[PDB]
Amino acid sequence: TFNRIHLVVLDSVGIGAAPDANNFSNAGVPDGASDTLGHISKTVGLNVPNMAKIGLGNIPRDTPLKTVPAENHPTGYVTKLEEVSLGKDTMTGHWEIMGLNITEPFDTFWNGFPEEIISKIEKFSGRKVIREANKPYSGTAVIDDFGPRQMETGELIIYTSADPVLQIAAHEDVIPLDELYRICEYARSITLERPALLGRIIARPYVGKPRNFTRTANRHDYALSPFAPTVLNKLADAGVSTYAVGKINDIFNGSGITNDMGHNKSNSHGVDTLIKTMGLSAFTKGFSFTNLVDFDALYGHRRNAHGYRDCLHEFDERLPEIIAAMKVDDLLLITADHGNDPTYAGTDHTREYVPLLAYSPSFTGNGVLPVGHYADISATIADNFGVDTAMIGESFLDKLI
Ligand SMILES: [Mn+2]
Ligand SMILES: [Mn+2]
Numbered sequence: 001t002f003n004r005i006h007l008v009v010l011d012s013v014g015i016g017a018a019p020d021a022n023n024f025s026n027a028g029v030p031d032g033a034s035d036t037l038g039h040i041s042k043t044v045g046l047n048v049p050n051m052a053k054i055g056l057g058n059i060p061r062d063t064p065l066k067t068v069p070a071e072n073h074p075t076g077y078v079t080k081l082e083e084v085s086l087g088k089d090t091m092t093g094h095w096e097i098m099g100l101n102i103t104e105p106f107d108t109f110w111n112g113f114p115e116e117i118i119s120k121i122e123k124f125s126g127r128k129v130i131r132e133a134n135k136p137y138s139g140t141a142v143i144d145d146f147g148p149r150q151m152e153t154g155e156l157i158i159y160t161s162a163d164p165v166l167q168i169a170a171h172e173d174v175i176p177l178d179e180l181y182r183i184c185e186y187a188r189s190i191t192l193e194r195p196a197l198l199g200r201i202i203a204r205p206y207v208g209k210p211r212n213f214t215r216t217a218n219r220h221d222y223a224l225s226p227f228a229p230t231v232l233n234k235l236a237d238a239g240v241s242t243y244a245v246g247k248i249n250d251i252f253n254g255s256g257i258t259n260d261m262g263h264n265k266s267n268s269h270g271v272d273t274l275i276k277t278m279g280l281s282a283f284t285k286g287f288s289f290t291n292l293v294d295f296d297a298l299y300g301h302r303r304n305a306h307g308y309r310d311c312l313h314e315f316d317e318r319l320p321e322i323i324a325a326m327k328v329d330d331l332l333l334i335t336a337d338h339g340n341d342p343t344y345a346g347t348d349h350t351r352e353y354v355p356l357l358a359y360s361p362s363f364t365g366n367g368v369l370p371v372g373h374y375a376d377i378s379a380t381i382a383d384n385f386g387v388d389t390a391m392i393g394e395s396f397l398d399k400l401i
Contacts, residue, residue: 001401002331002360002384006278006288007377008322009097010315011090011247012296013037014339014352015080016061024088026346027110031088031339034350036300036308039343041066044309048316051334054078054357058368076359077400079369081335081376084392088349089164091199093337094251094291098230099378099390106164107197110136110348113158113166117187117196121158124186125179129156136161139204139215143169148210150174156183162301162348164199166191172207177218180205188222199224225253231378232256232289234387241286245273248289267294267311271318278325287381300340301347308342328361331384331400335377358400369399 014036022030038061040046046067048056055074057065064070085096087105095102112118112134122129133146137159146157150171157169166187170180184203191198200223208214226233233256235242242258249260261277264270274290277283292315299308326332339352354374375393382388383395 001397002362003285003329004278004283004288004327005286005331005333005381005384006274006322006326007097007290007333007335007381008274009094009289009291010295010312010334010336011291011293012300012338012340012349013312013336013355014341014350015059015336015355016353017339018082018351018353021351024351026344026348026350029345031344031351034339034341034344034352036339036341036350036352037068037355038063038065039341040305040309040312041068043343044305046309047313050316050319051357054334054359055366055368056355056357059355060368060371074366076357076363076366077369078358078367079356079371080353081356081372081374082353083338083351083374085374088338088351089199090247090296090337090349091164091251093354093374094248095226095230096374096392097335097337097377098226098232098252099375099382099393100226100228100230101375101391104194104197106199107195108162108164108348109160112160114196117166117190118158120190121156121183121187125156125183127154127156127175127183129158133157133159135159139167139169143204143206143213143215144211147171147206147213151210164197165202166198166200167202167204169204169206172205172216172218177205181220184220184222192224223250223253225255228391230256230390231382231387231393232287234382234390235287235385238385238387240385240387241283243277243283243286243288244290245277245288246270246291247293248291251291264291264293267292267315268318271315271322275321275325278322278330287385296340296349300342300349303342303344303347305342323359326359326361330360332359333357333377333380334359335374337374360400363400369396372396 339350379393
């Protein structure tokens with residue numbers, strides 16, 4: 001029915017604490033007071049007239065978004081969607097958006113990896129791990145802060161980030177690449193189950209000299225693929241094109257992705273890439289899936305409400321460009337994968353409902369859809385292209401056509 005469907009994930013753009021929010025926490029504080037869009041709106045303001053026109057301010061909430069009025073003549077269909085999976089991480093949310101139910105949520109490690117994991121890597125490698133570096137850390141600061149020490153002692157530098165990732169930095173002159181990879185493979189093999197379930201292990205070789213290090217191209221990644229076919233696989237198996245923009249290919253480890261358009265330098269460069277992709281003469285039928293990550297990486301995790309607002313405003317300003325590039329029989333879906341309330345305690349994601357905005361020039365109606373679940377997105381897409389659903393989700397295609 002829609003010849004193309006373009007799904008855009010505004011990473012972390014939540015619309016209020018989920019019913020099961022208090023099963024999740026932020027530096028010990030349960031997530032049940034979180035509200036990414038509402039707390040932004042109430043503190044720093046929020047001017048998003050293009051999303052409002054589609055209907056962002058018509059999405060049901062107990063208390064309305066302070067600065068996003070209801071729209072009595074909306075141009076699209078909107079609602080909010082509830083996460084079923086037992087995790088609030090990026091991989092879980094995207095996998096569920098594409099139809100999986102994740103009941104073994106990836107572990108994150110705000111206070112570093114536990115002794116069982118470190119002790120094991122030390123015994124396997126014969127190298128000590130620098131304990132002070134075993135915690136969240138920018139890849140760059142960690143190489144600068146502990147590399148000098150590493151060059152002298154041969155110790156491993158094992159660090160993480162807000163994501164379920166284990167990264168091993170090792171200078172090529174003192175830790176041979178082959179050993180780094182063996183160490184990473186061993187690491188990957190002992191992190192397949194909770195409480196050490198990791199999305200990916202990254203080898204981070206690097207060369208150079210103190211106060212001036214370079215991270216080399218000898219990087220290798222050891223990622224988990226989705227454990228069951230997702231709707232991306234269903235589409236690809238049926239010969240339907242699947243175009244990925246931004247973090248999408250990494251998140252799915254390329255599974256069911258026919259055309260990876262690569263990483264975003266920024267949200268704006270991402271929107272440029274989506275627009276270009278929509279304009280390809282080759283792209284006549286199928287699915288595009290874009291992640292715009294800056295909301296999460298730059299603003300949510302850093303608890304910066306002012307910046308989060310500006311990033312939302314900048315996306316809204318560009319939204320008319322995305323729409324101008326649509327064909328009449330295209331569908332645009334805008335959503336998120338969890339919350340990351342910049343006003344909250346902690347520095348993690350927040351367990352929230354996510355907005356759903358739906359727009360096509362072909363629409364003969366508009367309004368508000370019943371509240372749903374993340375994987376309803378996948379099922380709608382499957383329904384549209386005549387392929388099977390994955391684990392979960394129910395189509396709302398008939399409310400759109
Ligand atoms: Mn995310
Ligand atoms: Mn995040």
